[PDB]
């Protein structure tokens, strides 16, 4: 299978570039050298900084939009049916429902990056 | 929530249930269960407290696990028959998987643990919806596939449901947990006769839904969720507590009330099948449910508990809203025993 050989070659060459990249240089490491970079000082770990419901909401709304996109992908073959009026009605139906989801998220705050 | 959004979510719950009951295709039945759960989760979280959130989370976990098991059963059935039509299952292990999934959705005894916690964690309106409307879809599927169920598995789960609902409800002072354990016992009563006569299952479901609607609407009218809060209701609206007492007596299956009809019909139909030990066990076990119903009746109507000084304020006020169809639900749950032969209309 040609595609499998192609994937094997790409992955193998990328990993070989890692190996040369990550083993060839001459090293001399101490504690303060590898300290995390914070513009000249030390970083605070704090406690679970990556928060805020908006980052999760955009992910969820992308997920649902992506599901409707999965429903839209068979469309190029769907236009090859004799029953074109039903197919057009259903494709436009799906797109109105996508637009309705966007509009409902839009009007009910939704897409906003609030205070 | 927005009243329009809440109405839409309620309608989506009912439409998922209807999709379950009108589909001939297993994929559409699974779709109906999915839609019902999706719309149901927000109505559980309507009040939004940590109890409501935990109730919704436990509900979601159990229902999603059951739905995945149901889909696996469908896929095994298709693997061995190529059939999508809801009919007898052509594979025994697929049938077992489907039976366990439907029992977990219903909340039968080995999968009953979610019912008391979720019922306690949600509001009385949410609990009313949970313990009445959510039983329709799995029971309708069971009635459709009843000719292929393993009677031993189903009867085991039903007997365990009756026993656990009786025992668990004995320890409760919370009205929502009492309702949940009563619901477990009544689901056991429904599912015991399912292998023999689905008409008896439909009859028992209708009677139970009438009683549960009446009781939950009386609780909402009373604003009481603990037995002691209900013990104050006599000093405010004694009619409510007397109606509640007759409804509790009906729930206990005491003749001549409506709650005696499903037990009597199910015992008759079971003895028609040389089933005598199990009906005797079931009738004897239901005395536990009747015991804690009678405890509630003692604390609510048959005796008068101490009231509070602040109750005089509530005397000068009426209810802003009135429960719909509550008088009809009360009459139906207590007085319909002379109409029993009408059960053949369900044939």
């Amino acid at each position: 299978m040609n595609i499998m050989l192609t994937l094997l070659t790409n992955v193998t060459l990328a990993s070989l570039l890692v190996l040369i990249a990550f083993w060839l240089p001459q090293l001399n490491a101490y504690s303060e050298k590898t300290s995390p970079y914070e513009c000249g000082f030390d970083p605070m770990g704090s406690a679970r900084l990556p928060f805020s419901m908006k980052f999760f909401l955009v992910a969820i709304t992308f997920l649902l939009f992506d599901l409707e996109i999965a429903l839209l992908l068979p469309l190029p073959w769907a236009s090859q049916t004799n029953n074109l009026k039903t197919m057009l009605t259903m494709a436009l139906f799906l797109l109105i429902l996508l637009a309705a989801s966007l509009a409902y998220e839009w009007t009910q705050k939704g897409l906003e990056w609030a205070e | 929530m927005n009243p329009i959004i809440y109405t839409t979510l309620i309608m989506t719950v009912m439409s998922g249930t209807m999709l379950v009951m009108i589909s001939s295709h297993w994929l559409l039945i699974w779709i109906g269960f999915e839609m019902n759960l999706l719309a149901m989760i927000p109505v559980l979280m309507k009040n939004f407290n940590p109890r409501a959130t935990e109730a919704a989370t436990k509900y979601f976990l159990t229902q999603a696990t059951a739905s995945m098991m149901l889909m696996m059963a469908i896929i095994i059935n298709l693997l061995y028959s190529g059939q999508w039509t809801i009919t007898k299952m052509f594979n025994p292990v697929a049938m077992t998987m489907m039976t366990m999934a439907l029992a977990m959705k219903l909340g039968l005894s080995p999968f009953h643990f979610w019912v008391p916690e979720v019922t306690q964690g949600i509001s009385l309106q949410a609990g009313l919806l949970l313990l009445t409307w959510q039983k329709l879809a799995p029971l309708s599927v069971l009635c459709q596939i009843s000719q292929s169920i393993n009677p031993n598995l189903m009867l085991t789960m039903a007997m365990l449901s009756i026993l656990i609902g009786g025992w668990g409800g004995l320890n409760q002072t919370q009205l929502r947990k009492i309702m949940a354990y009563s619901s477990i016992a009544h689901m056991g009563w429904m599912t015991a006769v399912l292998p023999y006569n689905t008409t008896m299952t439909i009859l028992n479901l209708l009677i139970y839904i009438t009683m549960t609607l009446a009781m939950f609407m009386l609780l909402i009218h009373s604003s009481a969720t603990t037995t002691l809060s209900l013990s104050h209701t006599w000093n405010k609206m004694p009619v409510i507590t007397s109606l509640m007492m007759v409804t509790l007596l009906s729930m206990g299956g005491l003749p001549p009330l409506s709650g005696f009809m499903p037990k009597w019909m199910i015992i008759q139909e079971m003895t028609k099948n040389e089933s005598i030990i199990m009906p005797t066990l079931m009738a004897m076990t239901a005395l536990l449910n009747l015991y804690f119903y009678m405890r509630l009746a003692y604390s609510s109507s048959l005796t008068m508990f101490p009231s509070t000084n602040n109750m005089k304020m509530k005397w000068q006020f009426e209810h802003t809203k009135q429960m719909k169809l509550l008088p009809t639900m009360i009459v139906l749950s207590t007085l319909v025993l002379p109409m029993t032969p009408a059960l053949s209309s369900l044939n």
Partner: protein, 83 residues
Amino acid sequence: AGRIASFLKNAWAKEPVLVASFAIGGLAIILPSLSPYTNYAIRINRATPYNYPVPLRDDGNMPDVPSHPQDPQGPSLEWLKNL
């Protein structure tokens, strides 16, 4: 009159993207139902021969089935050649 014209004015002045999108979507909704060519597209889809045209046995009284591919019987694609 002036109310809808003023609303369209404000929308064109402040949200041209939404105006263009709603107009495009509305035309996509409406125009197919008025096109003489939609039936032509249906006919083209019907005239595409994906499967083998398995024949029939002439039991007699089949005067409209051709016999041969080049007999003056059976549907013609002359309409499609000029369209």
